[PDB]
Amino acid sequence: PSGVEGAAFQSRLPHDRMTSQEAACFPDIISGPQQTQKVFLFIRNRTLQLWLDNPKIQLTFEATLQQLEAPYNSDTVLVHRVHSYLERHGLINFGIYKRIKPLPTKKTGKVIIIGSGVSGLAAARQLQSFGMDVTLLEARDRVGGRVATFRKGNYVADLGAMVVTGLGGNPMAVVSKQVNMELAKIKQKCPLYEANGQADDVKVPKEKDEMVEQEFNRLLEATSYLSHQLDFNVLNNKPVSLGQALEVVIQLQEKHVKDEQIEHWKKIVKTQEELKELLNKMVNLKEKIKELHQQYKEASEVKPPRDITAEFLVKSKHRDLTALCKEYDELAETQGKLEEKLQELEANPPSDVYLSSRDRQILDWHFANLEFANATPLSTLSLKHWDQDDDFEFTGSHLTVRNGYSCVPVALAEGLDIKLNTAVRQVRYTASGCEVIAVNTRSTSQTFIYKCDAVLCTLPLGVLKQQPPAVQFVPPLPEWKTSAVQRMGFGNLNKVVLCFDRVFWDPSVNLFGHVGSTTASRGELFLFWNLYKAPILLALVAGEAAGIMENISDDVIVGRCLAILKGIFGSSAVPQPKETVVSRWRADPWARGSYSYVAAGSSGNDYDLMAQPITPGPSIPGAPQPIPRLFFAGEHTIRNYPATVHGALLSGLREAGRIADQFLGAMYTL
Amino acid sequence: RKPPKGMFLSQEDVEAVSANATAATTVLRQLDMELVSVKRQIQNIKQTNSALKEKLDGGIEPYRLPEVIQKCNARWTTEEQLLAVQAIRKYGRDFQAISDVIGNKSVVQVKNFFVNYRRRFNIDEVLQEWEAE
Ligand SMILES: Cc1cc2nc3c(=O)[nH]c(=O)nc-3n(C[C@H](O)[C@H](O)[C@H](O)COP(=O)(O)OP(=O)(O)OC[C@H]3O[C@@H](n4cnc5c(N)ncnc54)[C@H](O)[C@@H]3O)c2cc1C
């Protein structure tokens, strides 16, 4: 889109309609005259446009009204209400921007944020910019959390988040404009390499490559039909998974292949039996013709002069023999026309198999790739909901951060009170306020107490899932919260960093697949990454393989890596790697996995439950309902953008707004 | 909206393959046996038909009688009339066959004969005699 409408789109808002969010804050307008609504919408869109056109500096209310025309600059309270709304909810003035009006002299309220991942950092920046006292407590010795970046010399490889999934409507597009941020596009060309005995691996020909991929897409779309149109969502009181449904679909396609073959061979036999019955008639007719010829010959040998009965016998037997020879030629004509139809039917058989061993192996690569995208085996994904966030995907080509994704959190961390090496052990929340108990990661006997008005919990879902708990809540989280934590899926994927002294692979190819031998290990080093002038190959472990590979030493993994690389690039042209790094996200105690997925039995609704804040019981019994104390951000708390950096970023922005509204009050409804 | 072009997913087959733990491989093996069963049936009836074709070897060429046609004459001879009466006794109302036996009398002339000499050759009796067989 283009213009003020482009700004609405870039902010993930409909340009021509008021959101539920807006309806809440501006109920007068949305219940009121259609005219004023359109006025509101333009003000909203124009302010967004202004912000987006220059996100390097703060956009003040004055500066906004400055660039407004009549009759939009007539009602200045409406302009203020809009600007403040957009400011609170982090649609304007978020990220890293030059401040016009220097921060308030004294701070109001105190907030402890657990974890300095992107969701944490984003909220911290906001809350601080709203004039609150913010301190982040990070267990690690670094910011960014699941945004990790390996560095050596100038060579850089993201062990965590790596891809910016399109700039169209992506809040990261703003951040990237705000900083240096050099983004490099990703060439989506990906050749696949299947084994060839003792010989080098052969690139899969464009013939198969394209037909298997299209079958893969067709299989997915098929499961979607199976889910929505046929309602195949529960089987034996258990929710149907994607992999579960994929099996059923594949099986039904094999059934079809066989059903087509059966009715083809049955079309042959019914003709092969028509021929049988015709050949029998022909044999019997030849027998009567043979006998009738003799009878005629005998009758014809009674030499003239014959009487008329003997004369009749000759003529009669003659006529009868011509009539039976007439009949035989009909049946001889049918015989040829059945034999011709028999070759016709045998020249056009139906499909031999649904998928060959070679096909099903390539298809398993596509499955592994999907298991990589969702960071989980397809047997765990909900059939009905695994793809609920598909509509909200950004436009534009996917990119990578050239100087390493940690570029971003580090830049967000600037000017914030971040206590590194501080592992939160217990969160206490009461009517009077909160205290957070943390220890030093280096010496765990050294204890820290933090008193605050509100706690923002950005602990990964994996952490929240730990049994026994890595963090204790006092009082415990309610059933409705813990159940959501339980039901939600938290997946895994891993990366292997391979540093070589020289680039031995195709330098123009960004990424190439390796086709595994079995379904079981389809995800094991199924894909290799290459980007910059840097000599790093990046091996990806996905699906069921990810979990198992964590229980295997670095050497063996690096071994299996080279084995596959030799098998493609020649058993000699592959040198030993100088530096190797192997991620273990499921083992990492500050992650306990990679990111969330919609598990079978869960839904998008559980993500909303996750974001829901907690309000403690009253201190003195009979005292009024207190303020909400415990707040949740993080990738697992944002329904429409889960399992992503931008989703975390947004979830942070969300909570900062909710906390501010709760502890500073909404100034725009005055 | 509907299954992808060439993808087969009927409500019925879904329930059947999902019915139990190994209903999937049961239905697929059942058709595999069904398939090899029909294949061996073809091999057999192909052999039966191969043998029957060998019995028809030579066709009916030694038994083919040369074509004899003479002009479709108008005059009834005593000789021809008697052939006709016998043909009516053997063939009945098959005006065609009767015409072929006599040789030089058209299918209409035969039909005329049937009504001309109806009294004199007792064609009534002759026709009921044929129906007795
Ligand atoms: C391998 C991998 C690849 C990925 N690739 C992509 C990608 O290509 N594109 C994309 O959009 N997204 C990707 N993601 C997801 C993205 O990294 C996350 O969604 C995002 O970083 C989540 O941010 P968060 O702040 O919610 O969680 P985190 O970044 O994990 O922040 C939580 C923080 O809390 C800290 N913490 C944990 N326990 C404690 C404790 N007891 N006390 C104190 N602190 C604690 C952690 O150390 C962490 O810093 C990937 C994730 C992984 C694992």
From Swiss-Prot, chain A:
Disulfide pairs?
Answer: none
Q: Where in the cell is it found?
A: Nucleus; Chromosome
Q: What residues does the Glycyl lysine isopeptide (Lys-Gly) (interchain with G-Cter in SUMO2) crosslink join?
A: 276, 303
Q: Coiled-coil annotation: which residues?
A: 262-348
Q: What is the effect of changing residue 119 to P?
A: In AIMAH3; uncertain significance
Q: Where is the SWIRM domain?
A: 4-103
Q: How is its activity regulated?
A: The N-terminal sequences of INSM1 and SNAI1 compete with histone H3 for the same binding site and thereby inhibit histone demethylation (in vitro).
Q: What is its main location?
A: nucleus
Induction statement: Down-regulated during neural differentiation in neuroblastoma cancer.
User: According to its UniProt record, in which tissues is this protein expressed?
Assistant: Ubiquitously expressed.
Domain of life of the source: Eukaryota
Cofactors: FAD
A molecular function (GO) held by this record is: MRF binding
Any idea which residues bear Phosphoserine here? Answer: 445
Q: What is its EC number?
A: 1.14.99.66
Disease tied to this entry: Cleft palate, psychomotor retardation, and distinctive facial features: A syndrome characterized by cleft palate, developmental delay, psychomotor retardation, and facial dysmorphic features including a prominent forehead, slightly arched eyebrows, elongated palpebral fissures, a wide nasal bridge, thin lips, and widely spaced teeth. Cleft palate is a congenital fissure of the soft and/or hard palate, due to faulty fusion. ACTH-independent macronodular adrenal hyperplasia 3: A form of macronodular adrenal hyperplasia, a rare adrenal defect characterized by multiple, bilateral, non-pigmented, benign, adrenocortical nodules. It results in excessive production of cortisol leading to ACTH-independent Cushing syndrome. Clinical manifestations of Cushing syndrome include facial and truncal obesity, abdominal striae, muscular weakness, osteoporosis, arterial hypertension, diabetes. AIMAH3 affected individuals have low fasting cortisol and ACTH, but excess cortisol is secreted after eating.
Family under the similarity heading? Belongs to the flavin monoamine oxidase family.
Tell me what this protein is called.
Lysine-specific histone demethylase 1A
Organism in which the protein naturally occurs: Homo sapiens (Human)
Q: What gene makes this protein?
A: KDM1A
Curated annotation (Swiss-Prot), chain B:
Its domain description in UniProt is: The SANT domains may bridge the nucleosomal substrates and the demethylase KDM1A.
Coiled-coil residues: 24-59
Query: According to its UniProt record, in which tissues is this protein expressed?
Result: Ubiquitously expressed.
Query: Where is this gene product found?
Result: Nucleus
Q: How does it assemble?
A: Interacts directly with GFI1 and GFI1B in a RCOR/GFI/KDM1A/HDAC complex. Interacts with INMS1. Component of a BHC histone deacetylase complex that contains HDAC1, HDAC2, HMG20B/BRAF35, KDM1A, RCOR1/CoREST and PHF21A/BHC80. The BHC complex may also contain ZMYM2, ZNF217, ZMYM3, GSE1 and GTF2I. Interacts with REST. Interacts with the SMARCE1/BAF57, suggesting that the BHC complex may recruit the ATP-dependent chromatin-remodeling SWI-SNF complex. Interacts with SOX2.
Region feature (Interaction with KDM1A): 1-74
Q: Report the sequence similarity comment from the record.
A: Belongs to the CoREST family.
Q: Where is the signal peptide?
A: none
Organism annotation:
Homo sapiens (Human)
Parent-protein start and end of this portion: 311 to 443 of 485
Q: What does this protein do?
A: Essential component of the BHC complex, a corepressor complex that represses transcription of neuron-specific genes in non-neuronal cells. The BHC complex is recruited at RE1/NRSE sites by REST and acts by deacetylating and demethylating specific sites on histones, thereby acting as a chromatin modifier. In the BHC complex, it serves as a molecular beacon for the recruitment of molecular machinery, including MeCP2 and SUV39H1, that imposes silencing across a chromosomal interval.
Q: How is it modified after translation?
A: Phosphorylated by HSV-1 protein kinases in case of infection.
UniProt-recorded name of the protein: REST corepressor 1
Can you give the residue ranges of the SANT domain? 71-122
